[PDB]
């Protein structure tokens, strides 16, 4: 039994930011997620390094320090910068985890690899040894499918080919692709040898992750798998129904057993 969460946090670009961080932290605390995957995690280019490449007030780092307020459980942070973002931010992705790790990677899944290009996207992977199996978790934030300088297929192939093994690869995040609207581009995702935990789930809700208040209701965020899994549940979270809103995207919360 393992519980996963993925959430595009729109870091430091949200109104009411501190309360929203607090909501997120409190939730992670109650639920005790094994792995949290986060996209649009920002830090100010001009702030001091704390350590590695992480600058003061990095959203993820703040989240973690807030998390410590509500749980004794040791959480670990792995973050990677992608490109120069909104304003004077570094935009990146992160993974938080309850578990210690065997491996960590940060790499570009895109052809663009310059911090000066919006379409350069770095991925963060984590390897956990769990119940005598090695599992790789990937936090992803992809470009629009129609993006004329990146091939989403190729990019996904880069992620999947980063390690050459027969490990369970779990691949989490914002894919900028509506499973309802642009079906051909969502089908294309799966063509890469991917299984969608939403579809595989025993219990599920409507699955909507972005709401612009059916005209404007979308499913843009996912949790994919390279193998078929026993997926007990797949709920949306932080949507003012199951927990308060913390971003401009809602999060996905998935329960897997193995
Ligand atoms: Mg956004």
UniProtKB/TrEMBL annotation:
Any one Pfam family here would be: Exo_endo_phos
Binding residues annotated for Mg(2+), in chain numbering: 40, 248
Q: Which residues belong to any copy of the Endonuclease/exonuclease/phosphatase domain?
A: 20-249
Keywords assigned: Endonuclease, Hydrolase, Metal-binding, Nuclease
Q: What is this protein called?
A: Endonuclease/exonuclease/phosphatase
SUPFAM superfamilies registered for this protein in UniProt: DNase I-like
| PANTHER family from the UniProt entry | ENDONUCLEASE_EXONUCLEASE_PHOSPHATASE FAMILY PROTEIN (PTHR15822:SF23), TRAF AND TNF RECEPTOR-ASSOCIATED PROTEIN (PTHR15822)
For molecular function, the Gene Ontology terms on record are: endonuclease activity; exonuclease activity; metal ion binding
């Amino acid at each position: 039994a393992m519980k996963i969460l993925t959430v595009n946090v729109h870091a430091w670009l949200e109104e009411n930011q501190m309360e929203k961080i607090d909501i997120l932290a409190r939730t992670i605390a109650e639920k005790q997620y094994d792995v949290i995957a986060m996209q649009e995690v920002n830090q100010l280019m001009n702030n001091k390094i704390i350590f590695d490449d992480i600058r003061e007030e990095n959203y993820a780092w703040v989240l973690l320090e807030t998390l410590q307020k509500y749980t004794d459980t040791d959480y670990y942070l792995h973050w990677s910068n992608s490109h120069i973002g909104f304003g004077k931010y570094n935009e990146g992705v992160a993974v938080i985890t309850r578990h210690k790790i065997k491996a960590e990677d940060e790499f570009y899944c895109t052809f663009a690899q310059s911090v000066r290009t919006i379409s350069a996207r770095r991925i963060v992977s984590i390897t956990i040894n769990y119940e005598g199996q090695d599992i790789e978790f990937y936090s992803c934030h992809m470009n629009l499918p129609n993006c004329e300088t990146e091939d989403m297929g190729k990019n996904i192939q880069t992620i999947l080919n980063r390690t050459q093994n027969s490990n369970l690869k779990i691949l989490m995040g914002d894919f900028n692709t509506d499973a309802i609207g642009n079906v051909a581009a969502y089908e294309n995702i799966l063509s890469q040898g991917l299984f969608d935990t939403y579809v595989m789930a025993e219990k599920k809700d409507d699955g909507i992750t972005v709401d612009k208040s059916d005209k404007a209701k979308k499913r843009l965020d996912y949790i994919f798998s390279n193998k078929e899994l026993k997926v007990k549940e797949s709920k949306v979270i932080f949507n003012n129904k199951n927990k308060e809103i913390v971003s401009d995207h809602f999060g996905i919360e998935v329960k897997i057993e193995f």
